[PDB]
Amino acid sequence: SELVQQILKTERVVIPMENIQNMYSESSQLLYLLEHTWKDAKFILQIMCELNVLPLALQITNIAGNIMSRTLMGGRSERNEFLLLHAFYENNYIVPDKQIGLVLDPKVGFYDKFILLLDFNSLYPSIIQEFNICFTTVQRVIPELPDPSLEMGILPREIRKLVERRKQVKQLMKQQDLNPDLILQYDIRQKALKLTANSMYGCLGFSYSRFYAKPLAALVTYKGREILMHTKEMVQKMNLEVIYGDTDSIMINTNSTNLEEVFKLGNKVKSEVNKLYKLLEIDIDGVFKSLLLLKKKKYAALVVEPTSDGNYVTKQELKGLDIVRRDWC
Amino acid sequence: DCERFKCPCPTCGTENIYDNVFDGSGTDMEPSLYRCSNIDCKASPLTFTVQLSNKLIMDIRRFIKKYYDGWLICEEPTCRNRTRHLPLQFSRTGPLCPACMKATLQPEYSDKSLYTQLCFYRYIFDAECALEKLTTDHEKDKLKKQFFTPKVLQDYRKLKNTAEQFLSRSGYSEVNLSKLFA
Amino acid sequence: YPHCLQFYLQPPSENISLIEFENLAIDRVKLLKSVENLGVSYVKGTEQYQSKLESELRKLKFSYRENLEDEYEPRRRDHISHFILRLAYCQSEELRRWFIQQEMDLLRFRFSILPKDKIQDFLKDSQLQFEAISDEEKTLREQEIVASSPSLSGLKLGFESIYKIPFADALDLFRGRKVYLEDGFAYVPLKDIVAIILNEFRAKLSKALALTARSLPAVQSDERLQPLLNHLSHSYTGQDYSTQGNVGKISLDQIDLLSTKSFPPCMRQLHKALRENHHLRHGGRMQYGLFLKGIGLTLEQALQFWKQEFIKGKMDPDKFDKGYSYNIRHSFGKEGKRTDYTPFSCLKIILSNPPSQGDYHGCPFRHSDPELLKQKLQSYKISPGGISQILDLVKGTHYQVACQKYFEMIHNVDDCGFSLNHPNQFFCESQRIL
Ligand code: SF4
Numbered sequence: 013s014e015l016v017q018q019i020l021k022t023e024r025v026v027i028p029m030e031n032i033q034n035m036y037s038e039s040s041q042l043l044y045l046l047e048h049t050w051k052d053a054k055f056i057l058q059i060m061c062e063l064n065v066l067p068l069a070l071q072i073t074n075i076a077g078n079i080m081s082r083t084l085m086g087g088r089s090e091r092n093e094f095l096l097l098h099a100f101y102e103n104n105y106i107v108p109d110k111q112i113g114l115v116l117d118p119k120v121g122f123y124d125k126f127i128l129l130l131d132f133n134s135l136y137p138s139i140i141q142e143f144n145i146c147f148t149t150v151q152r153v154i155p156e157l158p159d160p161s162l163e164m165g166i167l168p169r170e171i172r173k174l175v176e177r178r179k180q181v182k183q184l185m186k187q188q189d190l191n192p193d194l195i196l197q198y199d200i201r202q203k204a205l206k207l208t209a210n211s212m213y214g215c216l217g218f219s220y221s222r223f224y225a226k227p228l229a230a231l232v233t234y235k236g237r238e239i240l241m242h243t244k245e246m247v248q249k250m251n252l253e254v255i256y257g258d259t260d261s262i263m264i265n266t267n268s269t270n271l272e273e274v275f276k277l278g279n280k281v282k283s284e285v286n287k288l289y290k291l292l293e294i295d296i297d298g299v300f301k302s303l304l305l306l307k308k309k310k311y312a313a314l315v316v317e318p319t320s321d322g323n324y325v326t327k328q329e330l331k332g333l334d335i336v337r338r339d340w341c
Numbered sequence: 342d343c344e345r346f347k348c349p350c351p352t353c354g355t356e357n358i359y360d361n362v363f364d365g366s367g368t369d370m371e372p373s374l375y376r377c378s379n380i381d382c383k384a385s386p387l388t389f390t391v392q393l394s395n396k397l398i399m400d401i402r403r404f405i406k407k408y409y410d411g412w413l414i415c416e417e418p419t420c421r422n423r424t425r426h427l428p429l430q431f432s433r434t435g436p437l438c439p440a441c442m443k444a445t446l447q448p449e450y451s452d453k454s455l456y457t458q459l460c461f462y463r464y465i466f467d468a469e470c471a472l473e474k475l476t477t478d479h480e481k482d483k484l485k486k487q488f489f490t491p492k493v494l495q496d497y498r499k500l501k502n503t504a505e506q507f508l509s510r511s512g513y514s515e516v517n518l519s520k521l522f523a
Numbered sequence: 524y525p526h527c528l529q530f531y532l533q534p535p536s537e538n539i540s541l542i543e544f545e546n547l548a549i550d551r552v553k554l555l556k557s558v559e560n561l562g563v564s565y566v567k568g569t570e571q572y573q574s575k576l577e578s579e580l581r582k583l584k585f586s587y588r589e590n591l592e593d594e595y596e597p598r599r600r601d602h603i604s605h606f607i608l609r610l611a612y613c614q615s616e617e618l619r620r621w622f623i624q625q626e627m628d629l630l631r632f633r634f635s636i637l638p639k640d641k642i643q644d645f646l647k648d649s650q651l652q653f654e655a656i657s658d659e660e661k662t663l664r665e666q667e668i669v670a671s672s673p674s675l676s677g678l679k680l681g682f683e684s685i686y687k688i689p690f691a692d693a694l695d696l697f698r699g700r701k702v703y704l705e706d707g708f709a710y711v712p713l714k715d716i717v718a719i720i721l722n723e724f725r726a727k728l729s730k731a732l733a734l735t736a737r738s739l740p741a742v743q744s745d746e747r748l749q750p751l752l753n754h755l756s757h758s759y760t761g762q763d764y765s766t767q768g769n770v771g772k773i774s775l776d777q778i779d780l781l782s783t784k785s786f787p788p789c790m791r792q793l794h795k796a797l798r799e800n801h802h803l804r805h806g807g808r809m810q811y812g813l814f815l816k817g818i819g820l821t822l823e824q825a826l827q828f829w830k831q832e833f834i835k836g837k838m839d840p841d842k843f844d845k846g847y848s849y850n851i852r853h854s855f856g857k858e859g860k861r862t863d864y865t866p867f868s869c870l871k872i873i874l875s876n877p878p879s880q881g882d883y884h885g886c887p888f889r890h891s892d893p894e895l896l897k898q899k900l901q902s903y904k905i906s907p908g909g910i911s912q913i914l915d916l917v918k919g920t921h922y923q924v925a926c927q928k929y930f931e932m933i934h935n936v937d938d939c940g941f942s943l944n945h946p947n948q949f950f951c952e953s954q955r956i957l
Pocket residue numbers: 787788789790868869872885886887888889922923926943945946949
């Protein structure tokens with residue numbers, strides 16, 4: 013409904029029941045519903061034509077190793093299980109089978125100076141690799157990480173294969189004069205890899221999945237929690253402020269009026285968090301002119317992406333300010 | 342932000358309000374229950390302790406009435422719905438209004454009130470404390486010399502006792518350590 | 524002095540008064556912060572460091588003479604105090620550090636005064652090997668003890684109840700060749716006894732500490748303990764001494780005169796600034812503003828003061844009504860309660876409210892960059908040695924004491940009289956000395 017004009021950017025004329033008899037008494041508007049359905053399917057295709065669902069899902073399944081016919085249908089158990097089992101049964105185990113965060117009290121208050129958006133894309137695969145956790149590698153019956161002095165085992169090895177394949181993509185991407193075909197191939201491939209990497213930990217918290225060894229999940233949560241906490245106190249040192257936190261996001265204050273030193277502070281903290289751990293990444297994604305805070309998932313802001321020549325496009329953004337009581341004047 | 346104590350006079354017909362033990366000004370200060378407020382009339386409400394007692398209970402026994410019947414009200418400052426049929430879905434803050442499906446729900450008489458108010462009662466009947474906390478020697482000695490018998494004291498003691506026991510009966514002052522460190 | 528001195532253990536599952544709960548919380552936190560301050564002020568063995576603490580500590584109900592088994596009052600208070608604050612600091616390393624470190628040093632002090640017999644017997648009650656030599660062995664082994672270690676001078680070793688040990692926990696007293704050996708039952712002066720006690724204490728204590736932090740969610744389903752859930756180190760003091768409407772009445776004109784001798788650096792500099800600019804931002808005044816209620820002048824008088832400093836700086840004499848003065852007045856109205864209806868405490872002008880370009884609200888000792896601030900403070904006609912020893916503590920990121928030493932100097936009086944926490948208390952003092 014909304015998507016009709018967000019990505020697709022057109023109109024969606026819709027007709028309830030009581031006008032269906034009107035259109036029974038009508039040839040122009042009935043035919044109009046017909047051509048409307050025509051355009052409906054059309055826009056429905058344009059969805060794929062732009063988002064490139066087909067080759068994306070295709071490549072994913074290719075790397076996933078499971079029935080694409082059961083892929084579109086929706087699932088995270090499949091695109092994790094039927095992938096992991098590939099390797100796990102090169103390692104002559106025997107698995108079981110089928111049967112039947114932290115808020116940080118967002119300090120609401122308008123903000124005037126520029127605001128930066130830190131993304132912890134790839135946080136859970138990151139921490140898991142960083143601390144070499146794998147089923148075989150914990151006396152799981154409160155649990156504790158072993159000495160990293162062992163050789164990395166099974167699951168982080170697969171995570172590492174995925175990460176280095178992302179590295180491969182990022183390396184060969186810097187080419188020039190490539191046919192737009194292989195260009196899009198690369199970019200979409202990278203997207204797909206990031207998709208499954210973010211999916212990764214999901215294969216555990218979903219109790220009804222096979223590998224639901226919950227102590228794993230408890231441990232990982234504890235770890236990421238302390239991760240975020242250290243992050244907060246470290247940047248807190250830096251004479252700045254930290255308004256909103258979440259498992260996979262940090263909305264942070266910047267407290268300045270310039271535009272370039274901003275990126276310097278970005279790169280600064282980008283290296284700071286790396287001083288904690290190398291494999292862990294961070295993304296200096298977006299910049300806000302001024303911003304209002306009501307809740308996560310519900311606020312108002314000015315997306316200010318820096319256009320070339322140090323200029324910037326500025327658009328409003330109203331994340332969820334509806335007016336439900338259709339009663340006013 | 343609580344509700345004061347209002348009181349009916351048994352003889353003069355007027356009404357009263359009992360905020361703090363002492364009735365106002367400094368060296369002049371006098372006990373609450375001493376004289377009816379209405380300037381002229383000279384009845385002294387103290388001598389009707391027991392009657393006061395009644396209203397005390399017959400008042401508290403509606404505050405509790407509210408809570409266990411606690412309303413439920415909406416939060417998103419537009420919706421403003423009021424009901425009791427607690428719905429079943431849930432989220433971080435708690436449950437969610439059925440209409441404004443994007444918002445929480447709050448109790449009305451937040452327990453914090455109820456306990457606050459019961460403290461507010463137990464406050465103004467336990468003069469002993471406020472007497473002890475008083476600074477100036479001579480004021481204390483003179484007023485005690487004046488009109489703090491065993492009788493007056495004992496009557497305060499009686500009503501204050503009723504209040505205090507009636508809250509500490511069982512709701513809130515306890516924190517069961519045996520479940521807090523397991 | 525009391526039985527109190529004991530190694531924390533075994534959470535006491537009673538059931539208690541909510542009031543007493545938050546009471547103990549505040550009390551103990553006060554004790555901690557204080558001990559830290561008192562310590563960082565002087566050096567340990569100085570008798571100020573003793574007198575002051577043994578005054579405060581005894582004042583807050585934790586150390587008196589002999590009584591019954593464990594339901595004696597102050598020992599019980601100590602007990603429940605700790606085993607509450609345990610729930611306080613389970614959410615950092617820095618926090619858990621600070622808590623450990625402080626409790627450590629406290630126990631050190633509070634223990635260093637017990638009578639010697641009580642010392643050794645309570646060590647006995649603590650664990651097994653905590654046992655004492657016979658002083659005959661002092662004569663028998665003076666050569667061994669003295670010549671063995673350099674931790675003793677000459678022959679004058681006092682009548683210390685030296686102790687028998689298992690080497691198995693001597694793990695540094697001996698490998699450093701600092702003690703005689705009798706089949707690992709080395710004999711060491713009391714000093715290292717205190718040392719080892721404190722080290723095993725730190726170990727066991729941290730080992731316990733981590734556990735609760737691994738077992739938090741219970742509290743999450745209650746909100747009575749919402750402050751101590753994670754709300755101690757924040758913008759409430761010990762308590763509101765310099766609160767609304769304390770001693771003071773002074774006419775407008777005198778303010779500037781008093782300024783040059785009474786305004787803590789933050790204020791003083793902001794008042795200079797508004798003396799020059801005659802204009803201020805949306806937030807700024809809302810510090811200075813409430814700070815004035817410190818002395819508590821009447822609104823219409825304060826309104827008049829601000830009017831002078833407003834329209835002389837060309838602020839439209841009509842806006843004033845429906846603009847600034849409006850909220851300036853409301854600052855004594857209905858809502859503002861604990862938000863505006865209060866003055867500010869340094870721990871609100873430090874831990875938050877970032878000060879921006881060219882603005883003045885905010886702790887200088889924090890936000891003012893170091894050497895610019897060096898010349899700046901020096902411009903108050905200050906000996907550079909004081910400025911240096913001050914900037915030292917300033918980079919020690921503990922500032923109240925810096926403000927303190929500054930005042931100490933600028934009035935030359937060699938006691939701070941207190942441990943400052945609120946600028947208005949600072950002011951009431953500065954007026955006290957007159
Ligand atoms: S003690 Fe705090 S409020 Fe007072 S001058 Fe120093 S930094 Fe400012």
